[PDB]
Amino acid sequence: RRVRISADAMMQALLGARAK
């Protein structure tokens, strides 16, 4: 299964991956 999220990982994708 590939389901897991980290605080820094989710934050980096929240305001970084096609966001900011």
Add this chain to the structure above:
Amino acid sequence: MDDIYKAAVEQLTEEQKNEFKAAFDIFVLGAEDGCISTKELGKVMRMLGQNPTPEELQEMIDEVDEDGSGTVDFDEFLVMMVRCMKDDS
């Protein structure tokens, strides 16, 4: 002892506390009354490369929330962050 991760959530620091607030509104922009729900979390899930069903995130909201709303509020969002953020010791 217990309540170790929540102890940091209650104390914490403005630098990290305000950060969770700025990272919370973007997660839940149009979800009920400003609470990250299964649909809001699924939006960021697609950015990583996976599109799971709403039930997958419903289990995530139940693990961190159980007040009847079934939605990640500002506190639950910051409480879920320290859970995977580990401690400093």
